[PDB]
């Protein structure tokens, strides 16, 4: 897990030897793994590249971070408001700093991860201090231009 780098944000043009060919300049990528879905039978955008040394994986994570690969925000990492279609290049501290401009955050946010890879699932949950920050996130942040990924902010629970 230390020598392997988890890549997120892969489109349909990216393939299993294509990621190994793109990561060959960063370091000696020994193997590439792409988990296939059960309903569609294709990649879900997240994969893994197992290299030989941890320094090559660190250089690939520091070089290929927030890159625009196949029209997709590909990024390598070390393997009541709901935000969907978020970029995997952002972290919890980056999401807390991005959410601090609209309103005040009550605590540190959390992002959902896949049970197989564990880098990024695609959705996240963040809680605001009051309902005014949630309304400002649903008015402004729900549709704002993020890092090559159109996010969507919505209410997790609402009572009619």
């Amino acid at each position: 897990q230390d020598a392997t780098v988890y890549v997120g944000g892969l489109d349909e043009k990216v393939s299993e030897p294509l990621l190994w060919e793109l990561f060959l300049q960063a370091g000696p990528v020994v193997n590439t793994h792409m988990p296939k879905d059960r309903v569609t039978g294709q990649h879900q955008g997240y994969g893994f590249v197992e290299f030989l040394s941890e320094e090559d994986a660190d250089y690939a994570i520091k070089i290929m971070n927030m890159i625009k690969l196949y029209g997709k925000p590909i990024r390598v990492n070390k393997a009541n408001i709901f935000i969907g279609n978020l970029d995997p290049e952002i972290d919890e501290k980056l999401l807390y700093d991005t959410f601090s401009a609209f309103g005040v955050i009550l605590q540190t946010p959390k992002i959902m991860r896949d049970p197989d890879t564990g880098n990024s699932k695609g959705y996240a949950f963040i809680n605001f201090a009051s309902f005014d920050a949630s309304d400002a996130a649903i008015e402004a942040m729900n549709g704002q231009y993020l890092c090559n990924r159109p996010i969507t902010v919505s209410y997790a629970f609402k009572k009619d």
Binding site: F102, G103, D132
Partner: peptide, 23 residues
């Protein structure tokens, strides 16, 4: 976008004179 329409950011309501301001 030339300003911000947030309530707690750039708005004020003086209840002593009942004056509402927004910038």
């Amino acid at each position: 976008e030339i300003d911000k329409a947030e309530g707690k950011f750039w708005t004020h309501w003086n209840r002593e004179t009942k004056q509402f301001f927004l910038q």
